Amino acid sequence: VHLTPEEKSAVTALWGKVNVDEVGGEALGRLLVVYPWTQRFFESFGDLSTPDAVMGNPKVKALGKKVLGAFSDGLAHLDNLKGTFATLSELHCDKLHVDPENFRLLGNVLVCVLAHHFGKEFTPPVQAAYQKVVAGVANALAHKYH
């Protein structure tokens, strides 16, 4: 199901314009705000009591940056997402017990964040390509459950 050359182009062009210090934290922050049960995994992160607290929380932004880097990784290895995500899969599945449905949600949140930030540049074909990516990443990250 993976990307056509045209989709790869669309995806890399847009991703090149992404601020890697902000977008990851924006996505993680929104996950915590929009799907509040996810906060259960972040009891050590301090103040998450309001949308503003969550988005400006430095631990959230820091972790977000790491998440975005994994997506970047993923983008660079679309043909071996399983190997790329093995250690992360062990972590999130074997150690953390995160339900894999949450991997789908985070990926979709990231898609919403890209739409918010690129607006009309984030066309329906461009989103279609990105959905393949986030689906791929989610599936790979869930591998330890399969």
Partner: protein, 141 residues
């Protein structure tokens, strides 16, 4: 459960869509058909390519239904009862598909309303579309 803040947020976000409502509805459909090809099978009598007058016309009806939901947000089961019957009984739409369209509606709003789509407003909209989806899937029997 929709909070007063949710209701306010959704009313305000939707209010900004103005004359674009039909267009955004069509756009969301298009995003859904492209991103999630399984959903295309529900529209064999529709040509689903870009600029399709059918998708356009249909986007207007979808938007009208959402607007009806916003205007009667405290009475949504009643407001969308006909539609829930249609989607469950005649159309037999898979409930998973409501999540897909709801996502694409969120993406469409995000792409068009940069000022409005804050994290808080994002959360209200998600809850709103989930409540709509709940009503529309409540009539399987």
């Amino acid at each position: 459960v929709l909070s007063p803040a949710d209701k306010t947020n959704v009313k305000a976000a939707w209010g900004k869509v103005g004359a674009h409502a039909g267009e955004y509805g069509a756009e969301a459909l298009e995003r859904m058909f492209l991103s999630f090809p399984t959903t295309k099978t529900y529209f064999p009598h529709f040509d689903l390519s870009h600029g399709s007058a059918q998708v356009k016309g249909h986007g207007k009806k979808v938007a009208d239904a959402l607007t009806n939901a916003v205007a009667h947000v405290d009475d949504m089961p009643n407001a969308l009862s006909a539609l829930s019957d249609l989607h469950a009984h005649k159309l037999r739409v898979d409930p998973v598909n409501f999540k897909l369209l709801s996502h694409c509606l969120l993406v469409t709003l995000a792409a068009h309303l940069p000022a409005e789509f804050t994290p808080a407003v994002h959360a209200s909209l998600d809850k709103f579309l989930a409540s709509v989806s709940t009503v529309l899937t409540s009539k399987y029997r």
